[PDB]
Scaffold this active site. Structure first.
Site, mmCIF file in Angstrom:
data_model
loop_
_atom_site.group_PDB
_atom_site.id
_atom_site.type_symbol
_atom_site.label_atom_id
_atom_site.label_comp_id
_atom_site.label_asym_id
_atom_site.label_seq_id
_atom_site.Cartn_x
_atom_site.Cartn_y
_atom_site.Cartn_z
ATOM 1 N N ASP A 516 35.914 10.833 81.016
ATOM 2 C CA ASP A 516 37.195 10.476 81.621
ATOM 3 C C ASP A 516 37.842 9.261 81.021
ATOM 4 O O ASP A 516 37.189 8.231 80.814
ATOM 5 C CB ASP A 516 37.008 10.219 83.114
ATOM 6 C CG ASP A 516 36.478 11.423 83.840
ATOM 7 O OD1 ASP A 516 36.397 12.502 83.209
ATOM 8 O OD2 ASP A 516 36.144 11.282 85.036
ATOM 9 N N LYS A 610 43.979 -1.089 94.064
ATOM 10 C CA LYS A 610 43.896 0.183 93.335
ATOM 11 C C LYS A 610 44.982 1.195 93.645
ATOM 12 O O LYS A 610 45.703 1.650 92.750
ATOM 13 C CB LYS A 610 42.536 0.869 93.552
ATOM 14 C CG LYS A 610 42.447 2.245 92.871
ATOM 15 C CD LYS A 610 41.135 3.004 93.113
ATOM 16 C CE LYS A 610 41.230 4.437 92.512
ATOM 17 N NZ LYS A 610 39.964 5.288 92.426
ATOM 18 N N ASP A 791 42.972 14.417 81.501
ATOM 19 C CA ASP A 791 42.444 13.203 80.856
ATOM 20 C C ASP A 791 40.948 13.061 81.062
ATOM 21 O O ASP A 791 40.401 11.953 81.056
ATOM 22 C CB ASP A 791 43.102 11.909 81.369
ATOM 23 C CG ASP A 791 43.113 11.772 82.933
ATOM 24 O OD1 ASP A 791 42.208 12.286 83.660
ATOM 25 O OD2 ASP A 791 44.060 11.102 83.421
#
Length: 862
Positions: A516, A610, A791
């Site tokens: 990732d 986040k 991704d």
DNA sequence: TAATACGACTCACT
DNA sequence: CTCCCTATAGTGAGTCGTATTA
């Protein structure tokens, strides 16, 4: 050209013959039968079940047929839905309504009657058109193909997989056409509503609930699943037995993409797919003669990855997903959470019977999400259980308008943890020490062990060697796996991991290991601009430790916090200070000194920052961070008991919002400068060529065009939709009057056009990265199987080492050879702007990052 | 004839 | 004032005028 060049009869037989020619008459038939299930339940299947469908279907058909008599039996205008539905075979109408509705319910948020009706309308249209050929095509593959047994045996368990068909070997009758609907949104919604109406009528499957009556911006009408039905789906085993997602996987390799439509699915009696999913036909037509070989090369290789169901993981899911308390907390519970009891002191008009109004309202919201997570869940199992014994299954692919790649069938490799755990790659290799090492890094990554260097991940796995074995040995009794970050995947790796202990390095392992990318997008902007500090923040440079941008942003917010706690503004008196008397209100301007201490009491960790920094590449700036800080951390803190330090919520959210934007701006300068430069260009190309009186228009509003590194051309064209409302007497009870966007558009939407540029450019840009990577890993190395998720890039363990090298290589390559911004400028230069053309430009400065350092970067996968 | 379904407008919204 | 997510979409009643059809 398919359309016309052939007879409906020939069209029906072409697919099967070419599919029987390669692969065998058996599978060829099965593949087409599977596809036809998208429109009708085979009398064979159904009748054999003597599972909710066994009741729903018959009642719904009878209703549809009784509805037609009712309609023909009266004078006057016929209902608009009827005009269209009169034609369709009732057995197909029922089936599509049942299925399309349950799939829509897999949605937590959107089940407005528009969304549902729209999806039924769309599928019912696909059967009006195509239905005839579909009828013939079934009559065709039902007859056993002519002679020669060695050809029909087709499959022959040759422990080598079926290989894709060659493009040239495709008859012009297989080159598809018209993946776009041609009904008016209005008739599409009409048909849809009447279908739902009869569904409710004949069965109690769903119901219509009015949400937020009298609230201009939130009022709506929505479809809800009847409690009796949810209870069975969640409680019974295989309630969704014969109700499959609209798009299933293929049981033979998928048809290669050659043109703009017709790829993936084989049957001819189906609505064909589009290579690119657009908001309109016109927009799709732009690609008609584009020529982007590398793009079609990528889609086809991926498409060609062969998979199989992970039987050991399936055996476990089938079992524990029906427990009244599940060790995997992500699994939706079975019992309903009852409404929060009233305080008895009901009449009490304090915030009591307003707070309750919330407490209860949040429970309905959680019950809906719970019921949807359950349907969705049961579909994946319905599907995995269905292909469990298949030697292999393939997934056809599509691309969204920016190029990003998507597996097309609901149950797919791009899904959530349980879904991914249920799937593994078909053709593996003897693992090896190299392969085994990554099988271990992956097992660790599946737990939470991914913010530590590799020697540590391996340490984690080795330390837990007996736990891992105990779990693979008896997963039902040893449930330590069910507690791991990615429960189901982790377990897949546990069965695999033990397989190695029992066969050593010669073991054939096909589990997809995944790599990732840190923070995609912030990686791509750092690359294209060569921002050392930005790139190091994500993981472009070889660091001894794994950098965590959410963490580094947080440490910066905190320093500003401590500082503001010492100095910083004092609580400003009241609002009544800019005038005289009046609104004593706003009796509080809470200085930054009190605001900081409020935030220092709650805490503020990686968690607080986040969920407000990953939306950065979605256009969220300082303004939007506040209404993210409010509901993600403050609101749920208050509503949960704590949060008592936020005496003035709005003001605390408003303050944190500023500290974060402020932090991210010094953190990843590049990413910011580029997004603004991109916002600026969009603004001008969107804007209209005015002037003082003589408001004449030299250059109207333009779309934003650009081409990706691998050749995928993309066109951003947001437009304001012309709306309207239909007038529909519903169930003879009331007049349902849905507001709906029409197939007709007016002017270009300059706001959305500006907000959608930066996020859409990176996405497209990592989209071709992903494509160039698939191509390169297949050509330079020998990778055949790919696990792709925008991704995240994976393969069997024996090929991991090369894939890991291939992503780095490919990214370094594209950004040394292409200046995507500069290349972008050379697109909207002559194609845009006219007079003025200034005050916007100034390409951001290229920094000192050395793309080469990426090759040696341990944590920058992707 | 005279029922029928619904687009068009227009209001007011626990 | 979070972007894709083959997307998406304020509501029902009171009233009228129309082209249809048994």
């Amino acid at each position: 050209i398919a359309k016309n060049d052939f007879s409906d009869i020939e069209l029906a037989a072409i697919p099967f013959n070419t599919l029987a020619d390669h692969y065998g008459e058996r599978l060829a038939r099965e593949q087409l039968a599977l596809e036809h299930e998208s429109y009708e339940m085979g009398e064979a299947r159904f009748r054999k079940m003597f599972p909710l469908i066994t009741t729903l279907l018959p009642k719904m058909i009878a209703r549809i047929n009784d509805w037609f008599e009712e309609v023909k039996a009266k004078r006057g205008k016929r209902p608009t839905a009827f005009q269209f539905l009169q034609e369709i075979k009732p057995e197909a109408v029922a089936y599509i309504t049942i299925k399309t509705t349950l799939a829509c319910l897999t949605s937590a948020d959107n089940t407005t009657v528009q969304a549902v009706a729209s999806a039924i309308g769309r599928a019912i249209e696909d059967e009006a058109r195509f239905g005839r050929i579909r009828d013939l095509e079934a009559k065709h593959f039902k007859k056993n193909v002519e002679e020669q047994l060695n050809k029909r045996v087709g499959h022959v368990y040759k422990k080598a997989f079926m290989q894709v068909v060659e493009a040239d070997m495709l008859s012009k009758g297989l080159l598809g056409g018209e993946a776009w609907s041609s009904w008016h949104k209005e008739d599409s919604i009409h048909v849809g509503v009447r279908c739902i109406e009869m569904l409710i009528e004949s069965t109690g499957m769903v119901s219509l609930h009015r949400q937020n009556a009298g609230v201009v911006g939130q009022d709506s009408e929505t479809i809800e699943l009847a409690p009796e039905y949810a209870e069975a789906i969640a409680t019974r085993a295989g309630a969704l037995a014969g109700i499959s997602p609209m798009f299933q996987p293929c049981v033979v390799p998928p048809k290669p993409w050659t043109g703009i439509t017709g790829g993936g699915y084989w049957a001819n009696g189906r609505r064909p797919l589009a290579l690119v999913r657009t908001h309109s036909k016109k927009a799709l037509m732009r690609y008609e003669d584009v020529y982007m070989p590398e793009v079609y090369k990528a889609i086809n290789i991926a498409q060609n990855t062969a998979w199989k169901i992970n039987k050991k993981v399936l055996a476990v899911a089938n079992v524990i997903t029906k427990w009244k308390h599940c060790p995997v907390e992500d699994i939706p519970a079975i019992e309903r959470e009852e409404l929060p009891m009233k305080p008895e002191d009901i009449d009490m008009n304090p915030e009591a019977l307003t707070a309750w109004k919330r407490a209860a309202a949040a429970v309905y919201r959680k019950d809906k999400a719970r019921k949807s997570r359950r349907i969705s869940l049961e579909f994946m199992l319905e599907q995995a259980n269905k292909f469990a014994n298949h030697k292999a299954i393939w997934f056809p692919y599509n691309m969204d308008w920016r190029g990003r790649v998507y597996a097309v069938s609901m149950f797919n490799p791009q899904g959530n943890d349980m879904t991914k755990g249920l799937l593994t790659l078909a053709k593996g290799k003897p693992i090896g020490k190299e392969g085994y090492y990554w099988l271990k890094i992956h097992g660790a990554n599946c737990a939470g062990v991914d913010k530590v260097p590799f020697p540590e991940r391996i340490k984690f796995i080795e330390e837990n060697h007996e736990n891992i074995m105990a779990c693979a040995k008896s997963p039902l009794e040893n449930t330590w796996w069910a507690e791991q970050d990615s429960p189901f995947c982790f377990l897949a790796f546990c069965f695999e991991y033990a397989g190695v202990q029992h066969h050593g390095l010669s073991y054939n392992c096909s589990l997809p290991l995944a790599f990732d990318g840190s923070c995609s997008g912030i990686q791509h902007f750092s690359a294209m601009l060569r921002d050392e500090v930005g790139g190091r923040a994500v993981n472009l440079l070889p660091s001894e430790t794994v950098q965590d941008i959410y963490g580094i942003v947080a440490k910066k917010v905190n320093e500003i916090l401590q500082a503001d706690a010492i100095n910083g503004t004092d609580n400003e008196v009241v609002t009544v200070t800019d005038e005289n008397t009046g609104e004593i209100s706003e009796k509080v301007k809470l200085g930054t000194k009190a605001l900081a201490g409020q935030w220092l009491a709650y805490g503020v960790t990686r968690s607080v920052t986040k969920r407000s920094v990953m939306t950065l590449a979605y256009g969220s700036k300082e303004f939007g961070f506040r209404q993210q800080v409010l509901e993600d951390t403050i609101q749920p803190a208050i509503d949960s008991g704590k949060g008592l330090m936020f005496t003035q919520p709005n003001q605390a959210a408003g303050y944190m919002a500023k500290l974060i934007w402020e932090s991210v701006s010094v953190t990843v300068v590049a990413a910011v400068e580029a997004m603004n430069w991109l916002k600026s260009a969009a603004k001008l190309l969107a804007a209209e060529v005015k002037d003082k009186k003589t408001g004449e228009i030299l250059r109207k509003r333009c779309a934003v065009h650009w081409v990706t590194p691998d050749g995928f051309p993309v066109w951003q064209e947001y437009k304001k939709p012309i709306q309207t409302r239909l007038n529909l007497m519903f169930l003879g009870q009331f007049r349902l009057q849905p507001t709906i966007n029409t197939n007709k558009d007016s002017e270009i939407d300059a706001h959305k056009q500006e907000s959608g540029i930066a996020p859409n450019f990176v996405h497209s840009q990592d989209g071709s990265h992903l494509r160039k990577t698939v191509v390169w890993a297949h050509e330079k190395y020998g990778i055949e199987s790919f696990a792709l998720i925008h991704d995240s890039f994976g393969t069997i363990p024996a090929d991991a080492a090369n894939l890991f090298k291939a992503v780095r290589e490919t990214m370094v390559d594209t950004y040394e050879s292409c200046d995507v911004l500069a290349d972008f400028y050379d697109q909207f230069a002559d194609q845009l702007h006219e007079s003025q053309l200034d005050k916007m430009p100034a390409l951001p400065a290229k920094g000192n990052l050395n793309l080469r350092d990426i090759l040696e970067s341990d944590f920058a996968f992707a």
